């Protein structure tokens, strides 16, 4: 029993984190085989950061301008190149701890674990979701840039996020490992803002299914509803539309609990309309939307 | 900025988790140097659990009755002994991945990371506190027993918890790594029940100091309180007493924010009286009590 915001074990990723220094900028890099991946902004100064021309700044640098430290050991950079907003530093040593891995791009609503690091040294792990507005609600200070997000899908690490920046509202923006930003953000100091966010409906329902599995049942009712009527209600409360695809994905949890998705939607309707009336669900007074259906099945049945 | 329930990186502990089997019972063990630590109830059957006599069950076992598996590899058990409610299995190979570590017994209110495991293989990592009633609110299924709690300050892993059992209310009980239970719990399936829980007042205050640090001030007020009047009110909402020790511990966060501990206490009183009126603090609609003063200084600024 019990239901907790749970990260993947971070050990396979810990053994890939290095420190990358360029001039006075120090930040974190990801060492896989003989390449170190990090945010290209490592090459910028303050002034540069206002309106950087990355191509131009990069061509001015030698390999030996990049100092890469794996624990105590320096790695020799033998090559450098850019892909979108990430810098790829070729090094002379392949990482002996390289796990089986892929680079994947995740969709808004999907969750991942973040290993937060400072000076190439991992300090913390937490669970996040990609918000509909393509930000993440992370916990990051100066020095965190180049920290990464991942899922573990078997023994295979799927890298999905690299941290680049904080927005003025204190949320976080970054790229996939091919250097493409999530969201309409750029790596320069101009005015940027998170767009207005929405609640991830399918995740809230998943968490309601988790609560029932853990014995928390007071919000169930005798009512059912249609997709359309529900979606009318979702839109009103700044919830994402729910699709048939979502309904399909919740199938397992529906079968296990005997609550049809549209039945559970009737529950969520009521919560949105009436509130919680002083009650909690799994110890929360708000509806949690950072657990996927997969997350719930993984934690409430298996390893 | 941001504020998250954040666990320690789990890799130093992952390299220590093994599977321990006795008869038909399989659970998790912790391999440090040439010893594997696990719950002694691994030697119990169906019948045993009501009134097990561990000494009598154990004397009947040989080394080779204990199967220990580290990933693919079997370890040879060359010794066994019991300490309190943990079994120590001596093995023929020292764990080459053994981190620098110590065993520490924690007080209620302290937080730690849990690495949940099944079959000696890690499943997830999350953050917990020792509740005042000596339980933890974990996430644990059958087979999780022998999973461990830890902190990593510096490069040294401090092991503080091993999981033994689930109580009827769905909360969790276990031991330090010397096999002493937290609280009055025993490794017998008799009727035992968690004491009524209280909120960890010092932690809530710490978290209010965190919300100030991250720019959030709406809950402050112009009032102060005595320690004693604070405690008289706190107890009526099932909050733990706050001691002078707690006040001393909050000193640094007081200095950093310019808000005296008893002024923050005044704020908490009002929050308890009023609730939040549709507002949140660091993204919560409840008062969070699973971040220590140390945790707040670690994560913030
Ligand atoms: O925000 C930061 N860096 C430090 C930091 C602090 C806390 C959390 N994350 C990151 N940066 C660097 C790069 C950058 C831009 F290009 C555009 C806006 C912001 C930023
Ligand atoms: O409850 C369990 N084991 C299963 C379990 C389930 C969910 C989470 N953790 C563990 N046990 C084993 C040992 C024991 C006692 F001695 C006294 C009461 C209970 C238990
Ligand atoms: Na219903």
Nearest to B5 among A126, A170, A303 (CB): A126
φ, ψ of residue B236 in degrees (nearest 5): -75, -15
Q: What kind and span of H or E run contains A22?
A: strand A17-22
Q: Which residues pair with A175 in a beta bridge?
A: A162, A181
Q: Is A168 on the interface with B (CB under 8 A)?
A: no
Does A124 sit within 8 Å of B9, measured CB to CB?
yes
Q: Which two tokens stand for residue A121?
A: 């040294």
Q: What is residue A145's three-state secondary structure? A: coil
Q: What is residue B14's three-state secondary structure? A: helix
Is A145 one of the annotated active-site residues of the chain?
yes
Contacts of A274 (CB under 8 A, 6+ apart): none
Q: What is residue B247's three-state secondary structure? A: helix
Q: Note whether A164 and A173 are within 8 A (CB).
A: yes
Domain map (residue ranges) of chain A: 1-14+100-197, 15-99, 198-301
Kind of pairing between the strands at A101-103 and A157-166 = parallel
Instruction: Give the dihedral sign, CA A271/A276/A282/A284.
Output: positive
C-beta neighbour count of B274 within 10 angstroms = 9
Q: Which of A16, A38, A41, A246 is catalytic?
A: A41
Nearest to A215 among B1, B116, B170 (CB): B170
Q: Is B286 on the interface with A (CB under 8 A)?
A: yes
Does B286 sit within 8 Å of A285, measured CB to CB?
yes
| Alpha helices in B29-126, H assignment, sequence order | 54-59
Contacts of B171 (CB under 8 A, 6+ apart): A2, B131, B135, B136, B137, B138, B194
Query: Between A and B, how many residue pairs show a Cβ–Cβ distance under 8 A?
Result: 121
| Alpha helices in A91-170, H assignment, sequence order | none
Q: What CATH number should be reported for the domain whose range is B1-14+100-197? A: 2.40.10.10
Round to whole Å and give the CA distance between A101 and A37. 14
Span from the CA of A265 to the centroid of ligand 3 (angstroms): 7
Residues lining ligand 1, Cβ inside 6 A: A 41, 140-142, 144-145, 164-166, 172, 187-189
Q: Which two tokens stand for residue B148?
A: 């461990």
Round to whole Å and give the CA distance between A210 and A199. 17
Q: What is the DSSP letter of B290?
A: -
Matching residue, tokens 């990609």: A130
> Resolution of the deposited coordinates, in angstroms?
1.9
Q: Experimental method for this entry?
A: X-ray
- Searching chain B, which residue's CA lies closest to the CA of residue A13? B11
Q: What kind and span of H or E run contains A75?
A: strand A73-75
Selection from B292, B268, B290 nearest residue B127 by Cα: B290
Q: What CATH number should be reported for the domain whose range is B198-301? A: 1.10.1840.10
Q: What kind and span of H or E run contains A189?
A: none
Task: Go through chain B and tell me how many residues it has.
Answer: 301
- Indicate which residue's Cα is closest to atom 5 of ligand 1: A142
Q: Which residues pair with A122 in a beta bridge?
A: A117
Matching residue, tokens 């008799």: B190
Selection from A138, A125, A101 nearest residue A290 by Cα: A138
Task: Go through chain A and tell me how many residues it has.
Answer: 303
CA distances from A299 to A291, B41, B50 (A): 10, 24, 29
Round to whole Å and give the CA distance between A295 and A151. 11
Nearest to B125 among A7, A141, A303 (CB): A7
Selection from A220, A218, A204, A300 nearest residue A252 by Cα: A300
Instruction: Give the dihedral sign, CA B33/B36/B38/B41.
Output: negative
Burial-class residue A88 by CB neighbours within 10 Å (0-12, 13-18, 19+).
middle
Contacts of B209 (CB under 8 A, 6+ apart): B250, B253, B254, B256, B257, B259, B264, B293, B296
A1-14+100-197 with A15-99: one CATH topology? yes
**B124, B189, B192, B194: which to mutate for ligand 2, most atoms within 8 A of CB?**
B189
Phi/psi-derived region of residue B278, left when phi > 0, alpha when psi is between -120 and 50, beta in every other case: left
Q: Note whether B131 and B75 are within 8 A (CB).
A: no
Span from the CA of A261 to the centroid of ligand 3 (angstroms): 9
| Alpha helices in chain B, H assignment, sequence order | 11-14, 54-59, 201-213, 227-234, 244-257, 261-274, 293-299
Round to whole Å and give the CA distance between A160 and A137. 15
Structural fold of domain B15-99: Thrombin, subunit H (2.40.10)
Q: Which of B26, B118, B139, B210 to mutate to test the interface with A (most CBs of A within 10 A)?
A: B139
């Amino acid at each position: 029993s019990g239901f907790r915001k749970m990260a993947f074990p971070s050990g396979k990723v810990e053994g890939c984190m290095v420190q990358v220094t360029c001039g006075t900028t120090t930040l974190n890099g990801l060492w896989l085989d003989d390449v170190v991946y990090c945010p290209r902004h490592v090459i910028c100064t303050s002034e540069d950061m206002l309106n950087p021309n990355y191509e131009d700044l990069l061509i001015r640098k030698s390999n030996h301008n990049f100092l890469v430290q794996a624990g105590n050991v320096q790695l020799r950079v033998i090559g450098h190149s850019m892909q979108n907003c990430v810098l790829k530093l070729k090094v002379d040593t392949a990482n002996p701890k390289t796990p089986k891995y892929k680079f994947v791009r995740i969709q808004p609503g999907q969750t991942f674990s973040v290993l937060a690091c400072y000076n190439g040294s991992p300090s913390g792990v937490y669970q996040c979701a990609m918000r509909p507005n393509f930000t993440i609600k992370g916990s990051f200070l100066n020095g965190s840039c180049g920290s990464v997000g991942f899922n573990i899908d078997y023994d295979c690490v799927s890298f999905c996020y690299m941290h680049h920046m904080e927005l003025p509202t204190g949320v976080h923006a970054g790229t996939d490992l091919e250097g493409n930003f999530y969201g309409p953000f750029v790596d320069r100091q101009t005015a940027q803002a998170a767009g207005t966010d929405t609640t991830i409906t399918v995740n809230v329902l998943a968490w309601l299914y988790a609560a029932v599995i853990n014995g928390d049942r007071w919000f169930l009712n005798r009512f059912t509803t249609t997709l359309n009527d529900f979606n009318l209600v979702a839109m009103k409360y700044n919830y994402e539309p729910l699709t048939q695809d979502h309904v399909d994905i919740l199938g397992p949890l529906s079968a296990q609990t005997g609550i049809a998705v549209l039945d559970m939607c009737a529950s969520l309707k009521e919560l949105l309309q009436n509130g919680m009336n002083g009650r909690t669900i799994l110890g929360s007074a708000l509806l949690e939307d950072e657990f996927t259906p997969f997350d719930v099945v993984r934690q409430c049945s298996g390893v």
